[model samples]
Structure formats: C-alpha cells, structure tokens
Target: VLSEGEWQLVLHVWAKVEADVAGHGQDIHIRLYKSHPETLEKHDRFKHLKTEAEMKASEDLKKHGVTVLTALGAILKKKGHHEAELKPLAQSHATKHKIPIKYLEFESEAIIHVLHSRHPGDFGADAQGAMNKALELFRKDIAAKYKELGYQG
Candidate 1:
C-alpha cells in the first residue's frame, strides 16, 4: 500500500520530469530540479497543499527547476565562469532531444544541457546524486535483475 506522504516524497524526488526531445541539433531530454529557498519554510513547502497540481501551480515556481548554465555552459568563457553550484532546492537534466536550436527556449530557472559540448557534462555531482536516488529505487524494485548480474560490480 502507498501512503500519501510516501507518494509525495516520490513525486518530489521525481518532480523533475522531462518529455522526449530529438530532432534538431539539440539533445533529447528534459528534467527539473529544486532551487534553494531564500528562507526555509517552517513546514514542508506543501504543508497546506491538497494536491500535486496545487503545489506546482500555486505554492512556488522555484519548485519547478532552473538552469544556471547555458547549453552545458558551452557558451560560457572560463574568465567569467562562476562555479556551478548545486543546492537541495534544484536539479539539472541532460537533454537528449536533437532538435533545432530555435525550437527550444532558455527560460530563467530551467537548465537545459546540450550533449557533447565543450562545457562539462551534465553528469555532474548534483545530477549524479539524483541519478543515484533513481537507481536505488530501481534496485529495490528489481532486486532480481540486480542479483542476476551479480550487482554490476
């Protein structure tokens, strides 16, 4: 049985969802991450929310995601490059969609990383953390598959 609380945690962790993207010169992927709040809420950000939709649409926009870098920072110059910092409040996703550059929009708070650019890969520490969490879930649900390969060791 799934409890509402447990489901909310899952949703929060996986809230960064991405639709398929593949066509133009861009990568094909989309993902979301949380932004560290200016101030921690006394209670859960959704303490009063009744539904997931409400949480995303009403409570806060930071809950959506952000991209501090541009195209994997491919367009950035090292001289002006600030450290790529990760916070608990946000996440970054590596897009795999190979579509025309014009088709996509780089809005504030949304980080879209292009693949194979000179910039560092999206598989950074933060992204790795998120992937690790996802893998843990997979391992729990598919223990047999993991065991079959003797645990990818």
Candidate 2:
C-alpha cells in the first residue's frame, strides 16, 4: 500500500545505502541489540554473541542483517504485501529466533535510526514520512503472517 511517490522516496533513500547493504543491515541489528539487549539474548543465531565485539565478528548476524535489508528492498520492489514472502521469515523469528510481535519495533526503530542518524541531510522530513509508511506496511504484512501461524507477540 505504498504510494508511487512514497515508494520513490523510499527507494531513493534505500539506494543511497546500496553500497553497504550488509553493513547497514548489520548496524541496524547492532543498534537493536544494544538498545534492547534482549534481542541478542533471545535470538538463537545471535545469542552466541557475548559482546559488541562478538556481534561484529559474527557472520550469522551479518548474513541475517543482509536478509533484513533484502526483505525491505523486496517489499518496495514487489510493491505488494509481504505476507507471502515473509511467511517463513515470520515463522523463524517466532520459533527459531523467538522474537515477539512487540519486539518488532526493536528492529523497525533500529532501521529508522540507521536511516535518520546514518544519513543526516539525506533523510529529510518528507522522506522520513514515506519510510515510516513503508515500514508500517511491512510490519502489518509480516504481523499477519505471524498471527496466522498462531505465534505469540
């Protein structure tokens, strides 16, 4: 449910970080782990990491982070809902990662933080609005997938 213009803005901002998709993705998770600590403590793929240094050295986190960004790009490029695509993703987080629906914001905010703080002038108010909407669409779409699977939070 992204407007053409909103989609354009979101793509524009996303392209700016194209060169470091994995890096950006990793940073988003790093930010989330730092802010919520529980995320690192909860994720099976991530719980092994004992410290910030450990997280940076973790290839799984790096790979998973790239997966995160890839999902976002898929949402915009598909210009459709994310339920079908995120079905497995939602399940893994529910079972494998043990991430709750409430914790969804941990990563969402981390992504926004990456864009807002990582790109100062690039992320203006208008673009911020567009990105927020895009993230919201992504959230609802994936949330439905999780709910259908009978997952908690």
Candidate 3:
C-alpha cells in the first residue's frame, strides 16, 4: 500500500520526470526500447526501427513515449483508484499485446531509473523506496488483471 507521504514523494519527482520526458520523448522511448528490444518487436510501428538512429529520428517513437507518459500521469493522478483504473491497461497489455508481468516489472524499474537519471540529487533513497513501493502496488493490480484475463504470465 502507498501512504500519503509516499504518494506525495512520487508526485514531486514525477513532475520533473514528466517535463523531461515531454521535451525529450524520443530519447526516453529509445532508451526504453534499447532496454527491452523485445518490446520493439512486439509493436508493428516500432518494429521498423532497426537502429538507434532510426528510433531516435522517428516521430512515432516520440508519439508513443508521450502516450506512455500520459498514461503514467493518469494512473498516478487516480492514486486511490489505481486498481480499478489500471485494470483496462493491464487487460489490454496481457490480452491484446500478450505482455508478460515481467515487462511491467521492467517498466517499473525503468521509470525509477529514468527519474533518478533525470534528477540526480533529487531522487533520494527514501523517495526511491517510496516510488518502488508505489510501483509494486501498481504492478500487483496489473498482475491481478492479467490473471483475471486467463494469462498465466
């Protein structure tokens, strides 16, 4: 469970993350793809990006990143209602995209990594722990939806 202090902590860091990613969506998207190349192959649009240069230059990558960032914002904003709000996202990823629970786990780490890298001194250990706890709660909800959709993963 996420406490009020934890939520506030993440919200503070997330604001910086949001602004950075909004301005450099392509870089972040490419970073995400590089970390999980399998994800790129899973998407038809992203599959065409055979090289880092291509991915960085593609408008689609930037668009996709913005969409991802937007969704993250929505999930965070819904705070107390996360489980319900994230169900659709989980279901779609599991059922439609056949995404595994591990990928979401990876995404959780990736978000933290990006946040820390973007704001060096800002992400303290305390805040990092809180963010991880919050993401775990999110992942738990997403995993539930994944299981509900009959996906063992």
Candidate 4:
C-alpha cells in the first residue's frame, strides 16, 4: 500500500539502486550472507556456499537519501490509509504475534518518509503502532534487521 510517492521510491530503489549497485558497482555488493560478527556462524543464505569468493560480490549501489515503503500482507496495512485501525491493533497485536511491543517499535517503517516526517528525527518517533503492524507482516527477524539499521516506517 505504498503511497503514489512511496511506491515510486520502491520501484526506484530496487530498479535504480539495488539492481545497479548489486550488478556493476564495486563499492556496493551483496554477500551471500551479511558479515557482522554475530552472524558469522549462523544459518544464512551464504551458509553452505563454502568459498568466500563464492559469496561476495561488489557493486556500486547508487543509493541516495531517498527511502521507500510498500504495502503488503493480509490487509491493507502499509497503505497508510488505515488510521482507524492502527490504535486497536497496536495494542493487542503483541499477544497475537508473541512479540514484545510498545508504541515506538510499531510505526517506524510506515512513518519514515511521510510529508510530516521529512525532518530528521528518531526512527520510531510517533510511530509505534504503525511499526507494530509492519513487524507483524515482515516478522521480527527481517524487521529487526531493518529496525537496527534505522528503518523509519
């Protein structure tokens, strides 16, 4: 449910940044697995690849300051038009999903680039509920990765 503007960034990020950077740019690359020390021995995409060279490829990802959002899942969650449902869901979703949640963690991804949030601020500011919904769909593993990297809705 990306907005017209956010949808544009989704296409643009993948098309312009991901494809190009992961293809032809040396500075930008995708490791079969990420190399943070914590995941070195963990199961990952690169786990059985064996050779280091087999897992590392560099590209010059041409990413800019622009960000992206997308709408997907059982409902129209990320569409940014569900103001009516956010409050209720954010509160009870914790038990349903078994994820520890408060207000801040829920809406981080959805509010990242909204017009009112263009100014630099904390990642989860004013967005706990929205982020909660996103976490429900994306799950804690992937969402936590993006969350640690400062995903803002």
Candidate 5:
C-alpha cells in the first residue's frame, strides 16, 4: 500500500524517468550478486554459468531480469494488483524450491542503488522517495506472505 501521491510518483518515475527497464533490472541483480557472491547461487538460471562475462552475457539472465522487472513494474503500475503474483512467489520460493529470503533484502537494496544511479535531473528526489516507499511495501508484503505461507526455507 502507498499514499496516493507516492503511488502516482512511483508510476510516474517508472514510466517516465527510467530509460531502460531490463537494463536496470540486469544492473540491479548484478549489483546484488556482486555484494553477495553467494546470491547468484540461488538462481538455477545462472548457477552453472562460469566467469564474469559468461554470466553477464546471458539470454537467460536477460529473460530472467525482464520477467522480474516486468512483474515488479506491473505491481506498481496496477497499484495493488499483486495478489496473483504473490501466489507463484509463495509456491516457487518455498523450501520445496530452496530459497533464502535474505536475497530479497539484498535485491531491493540493489534496486535502490540502481535507481539512485539514474540521471539525477530526470529521476529527482521525490521520485526516489516514492520508489523507496514502494519497495519497502513490496519487501514487506513478500515477507509477510512468506510467514503466512509457512514455507520456511
């Protein structure tokens, strides 16, 4: 949930300021994996991909980033229409699928980093603020749902 103004700013910045969604998505995950090397191990998509460029130059990671960013964008753009999206996350990230939620925390921080790297003139302070609020709620929802789902991993 977000304030009406915050929601508007999020949708606004996402649609207007962000130049490349998939690029930002890739950058976000790259930053996450960089800081926490083991984080890459969580993804079967990149689990066996050896070396830096090998992992970075991945069609799979491209699709992976696109889908994840699209999902997140859809949630913000639709403004509370993430009920269906959470279901698959609950199922796919369960212990049945081998998951650690700390990755989500790291991932969001990486996303924030990526946002800050956006062109300052276009991105602006309020846009960043809105995104921060949106992401916090996004992280909260997943954690809360994970707890409720009782799928510790």
Candidate 6:
C-alpha cells in the first residue's frame, strides 16, 4: 500500500518527469543497458545489439520500450491502485520472456537513476521513498506471477 504522501509525491513527480522519460523510449532503454550491461545478455532478442545506437535503432527494442512505458503509464494512471492490472505484465516476463526476477530490481535501480538525473538533486528523500515503494510493489507483483507460473528460480 502506498502512503498518502507517497502517492501524492508519485503523482506530482510523475507529472513532471513522465513526458521526458517516456517520450524517449530509446534513451530509457539505452540508459538501462548502459547502467547494467549484463541485462542485455538476458534478452535473447536484444543480446546481439552491440552498440547503444544499434539498440536504440532496433524496431523491436523501440516497440518493447514504448509498450513498457505505456504499461507504466497505465499503472500510474490508477494513482497507485491496481491488482490484476499487473498480472499480464508479470505473466509475460515470467512465462514468456523468462526474465530473471533480479532483473526487475536492476530495472528499478536504473529507473531511479534516470528519474534522479531528470531532476538532478532536487528530488529529495521523500521522492526516492515513494519511487522505491512503487517499484517494490511492482517487483512483488511480478514475482508473485513468476511463482504462480511455477518459475522455480
């Protein structure tokens, strides 16, 4: 559950930063890959892209990033309220992609870093706390789906 303060912070910062981050899907994906290059190897479809520009230029990568950002926007549109909304996303990663659960944490970290860079040092601890809570919930939901799908790892 997100606190009232956390929810408010999420809504506010999301309003400010969403456009910047979401508009550049390739940048977002590139930042993720640059921050945690190991993650690239995890994606069978993405592993071959050797350079940042290559990754950015790939239609598949671009589409996937846009799709993910769209899903994220959909969740935030709920103002921190969701349930089955997250299940399909979780199912896709766990059952289809077979992405390791740890990658979720890495993704969360990368996003946090991106968010921080967007606002620099202006985003205080309160904002960080709210984002952490949101990402944790996202990770929790995804992991639950992973378990439900009988993913042993």
lDDT of 5 by residue, 1-153 (tens): 677888888887677424677678778878888888988876776877666676668878867887888878877776766777766776667635556677777887888787778656545788778888887777667777777778554
Which 10-residue window of candidate 4 scores lowest in summed lDDT? 58-67
Give the clash total for candidate 2.
2
**Model 3 CA lDDT for position 71:** 81
Question: How would you encode candidate 3's per-residue C-alpha lDDT over 42-153 as one tens digit per residue?
Answer: 7887787789888777877777778877787778867657776787788788889898878777667677777777776879998999788878877788888888889978
Q: Look at candidate 1 and tell me the lDDT of residue 51.
A: 44
Q: Which digits, one per residue and each the tens of the lDDT, describe model 2 over residues 68-132? A: 78876876766665556777788887767667766887788888899998887879999999888
TM-scores, all models, native as reference: 0.20, 0.86, 0.88, 0.27, 0.84, 0.84
Q: Which RMSD values do the candidates have, in order? A: 18.8, 2.0, 1.8, 12.2, 2.3, 2.2
Ranking by lDDT: 2, 3, 6, 5, 4, 1
Give per-residue CA lDDT, model 6, range 80-143, as digits (tens).
5656678887777878777887887877777777677776564689888988888788777777
Best candidate according to lDDT: 2
Q: Report model 3's TM-score to 2 decimal places.
A: 0.88
On the 0 to 100 scale, the lDDT of residue 80 in model 4 is 46
* Model 1 stretches astray by more than 4 angstroms: 12-16, 19-135, 149-152
Q: Backbone clashes per model, in order?
A: 24, 2, 0, 19, 0, 0
**Candidate 3 local distance difference test against the native:** 0.77
* Candidate 1 local lDDT, 1-153, one digit each (tens): 233444343333232322311211111212211232211232254345444444445424322222322232221222112133211111111122121111222221122243213123444555444433433332233333333434321
- Least lDDT summed over 10 consecutive residues: which range in candidate 3? 22-31
Q: How far off is residue 80 in model 3, in Å?
A: 4.0
Q: Which run of 10 residues does model 2 get worst, by summed lDDT?
A: 75-84
